[PDB]
Symmetry: D3
């Protein structure tokens, strides 16, 4: 199975929206969420990747226990989250701990329960509601194949 390193930024259950500066490597508090919400999974980005956005690929890792900001996690993709915000479209690869036999039952998006997909979906749609000039309008889940595809592309974009 495919594998890559994910740098976690925001731990599951956080309302503080942390970001990592991609030059200094410092953790930074972007802002406190204006809505009464909390990140449903550990949120971050895939190290050594690059998209059309300019930034690296955003990522979502399902973990038994959350971690700290800036922490590295070797993960593998089981799907991807496509959505359209006020900055056009951005993608978010759904991931699972790599080299962990406890996560062998989750091989693709269909193995991730709809309840958690619906929750993650719900979060990203509404978390910016009370921020002027910010929104999330479209959202849908796509399978491991297109996720691995988009990751394969974005690894190559980083090389050049």
């Amino acid at each position: 199975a495919m594998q890559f390193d994910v740098t976690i930024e925001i731990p599951k259950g956080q309302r503080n929206k942390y970001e990592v500066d991609h030059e200094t490597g410092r953790v930074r508090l972007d802002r406190y969420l204006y809505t009464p919400m909390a990140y449903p999974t550990d949120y971050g980005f895939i190290e050594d990747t690059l998209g059309d956005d300019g930034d690296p690929l955003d990522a979502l890792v399902l973990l038994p226990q959350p971690v700290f900001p800036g922490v590295l996690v070797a993960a593998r993709p089981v799907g991807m989250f496509r959505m359209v915000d006020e900055h056009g479209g951005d993608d978010k690869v759904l991931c699972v701990p790599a080299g962990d036999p406890r996560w062998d039952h989750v091989q693709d998006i269909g193995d991730v329960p709809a309840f958690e997909l619906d929750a993650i979906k719900h979060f990203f749609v509404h978390y910016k509601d009370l921020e002027p000039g910010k929104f999330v309008k479209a959202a849908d889940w796509v399978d491991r194949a297109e996720a691995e595809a988009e990751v394969q592309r974005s690894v190559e974009r980083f090389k050049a």
Copy 2:
């Protein structure tokens, strides 16, 4: 000046929806919220009150630090959240700790920041979204004068 005991059953920043079984007096777990949200303020009910649904009038206490389920808080009202859900209407009296000079600046609804109010509204609208048969269709923030009316109106229902 009004004053009453609010039994807080759900702490701030929690996703486990706790209920106090008014018959037995025990703290019961109702459900884990289906949306990835957390209670904006400590949420509970007012003691020795009663309403149309046979359940006590609900309360929202603003605190510098959260409390535990089943904890009592001497509180005074400063507004009320009027919402209309699945089971008709449910009004929630926004309160402040009584006998605390640190909260003397909060007298009426206008004294509470609009951002806190928008966040509290946002929660009670959206928190039952993914649950089937559950919904919310009207949501307003009324002043203290009306909150004091709805308390007293509900206090007397208990007296009967």
Copy 3:
């Protein structure tokens, strides 16, 4: 299906071994565990039950987020962990939230992954190691069907 209330004595991830006093209903601290390990799931006993020893039938509740000591949970049995401690035999009914469609996929002992069962098993074997005179020799897993009997056994002898 069968359904009952479980009082949670010890939250998941606890080294403090709480126990509910059954003559009063109070939450007594039994002891801080001598071993460097925490309770693998939310732990407690089934309400309105009585065993071969005078204590209610012990129970484990699979939960997404842990609760507090003394909290009630509408439960549904899906298996049972039998051990043999220093005081002879003991029974541990493995349960899930009753009425939560997120736990409809778990209908029997086999549905729970064997890593969570081995973890639970590993805890109850070793947690009394450094305590003197106390031990655990035999420890195996039975199925839902037999667990349901043990409950109903404990129910009827309680009725008497």
Copy 4:
């Protein structure tokens, strides 16, 4: 073999919320959020089935490896006692350890408890009501187990009524 009793913990260690169990109801109430940037240095509560001069149970300080929740019972034995003087006059707070726990066998009398912790506990109770409107602390000091047991002994026979 020794003297012991129940202790209902009201406030866990590291807390700024001032919880109070109603002795007539059994309900846990939030008294106040401490007005100073200080946390309770030990698990604070009272000795169950006692009665102090003030018509309330004798206060207790239980040293624990890990804190508990409010309303939790802990079988305990006294090791010393904290006597202070505040706006109400003089309160008495029994310093305790878990009863029947051999990990605390090395703490028999107050001299066994290290100085930095006794100071830390005292320092809290001197300063915790400084910024609080009409409340203050004048004096505070420690006494040995002999005196500690005696006040509990007075407090237990005084309970019978």
Copy 5:
């Protein structure tokens, strides 16, 4: 208006006193506080600055939720806490999140409630009581005007 990056080294509600080694940039546990107190705000230092100490200016950031050690926070001054300890005089800039509309009502030291200002003062007056050969004899608050002066002085001292 003036604005800068604060590096929070000690989160709010902490008795562990962390500090950043300004040469290596790594976090270091200086000492567990000898008194039973906790930092009332998030405590840190201003980046790209230097006082007479040979050390940057210490910063006090008011936040809705605390951050982790080493996290950057874009902030602006609204006052300054000036004290005199055993080593000499130490000054601490009282800040709020910059570019955050929820803190736009906080403009000067007068806008921060006195209760919180007394509390912050009380910490630094008493947190080194039980520490030997360590004390403070002066503790006063000053406005943004004088605060901004010291922040600028030290920004200029940085260039060498």
Copy 6:
């Protein structure tokens, strides 16, 4: 009195096993423990050391309150935990905070409570029981002298 810097990797009470990448410097999640156990003391490694197995000296630090991953601590040794996992000798140097008057009564292994030494031993022996092809077959405590000697050997190994 010998002293040195320890980098803490895993705070006391964690089930997430973090690891500092020595060649990189970043914190990584190695694995979530398969056993239901938690690290009984803060665990990490001594800075600028080198052993037969290519890593630095693993170290245990007794603290009143835990730290975060990557935090540095001035520490002095009082003993050493000898163990033999699947990869032969993997000793752990037991430490206390250096220059902290509250730890002066702890000068050698005998001064540490036996119950806490039993718990540390217990942890490392069992925490890989459920992981296949992994174990700990040996476990012994030794003098401060033995500990100090092994440390000084590995400081010698480092200079190359």
